[PDB]
Amino acid sequence: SKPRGINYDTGIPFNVLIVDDSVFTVKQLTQIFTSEGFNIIDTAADGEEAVIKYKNHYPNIDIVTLDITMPKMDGITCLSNIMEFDKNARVIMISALGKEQLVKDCLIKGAKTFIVKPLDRAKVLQRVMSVFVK
């Protein structure tokens, strides 16, 4: 079954940038994506590091998963910064916070979709691929 993490126009894995202040969550997301064929191009533990790394890899990042509550720089501020730098960025918010207006505000600011924790492989994957239509 065509692993979803592969770009079938080249056979090269899609690149994912994982951003969360918990190494536990970074590991869970890493397993979820790699098991499906994706390549974790890089990871960041806070919003500042995320911005730096996103710019560093920029043309090559296909998708970014972004936590909200984080030291130094929270995910909402990070989202605006990444979208400001690259209007074509594809970011999926993955957070413990789910107030419905917060969701709309992130989408307004540019995020493609939102995922509320606790996580499960199936859900994450279904959401990740919806930002993959043409």
Interface residues toward other proteins, by CB under 8 A? 21-25, 27, 69-71, 95-101, 116-118
Distance of closest approach, residue 70 Cβ to Mg ion, in angstroms: 5
CB neighbourhood size of 73 (10 A): 18
Pairing of strands 15-19, 12-13: unpaired
Please identify the residue of the shown chain whose CB is closest to the bound Mg ion.
Answer: 69
Among other proteins, Mg ion, none, partner that 71 touches (CB below 5 to 8 angstroms by kind): other proteins
Residues in 59-118 at the binding interface with Mg ion, rule: CB under 5 A = 67, 69-70
The answer to whether the beta carbons of residues 52 and 21 sit under 8 Å apart is no
- Give the nearer residue to other proteins in terms of CB position, either 12 or 116: 116
Runs of H (alpha helix) within the chain = 23-35, 47-57, 75-85, 100-108, 121-130
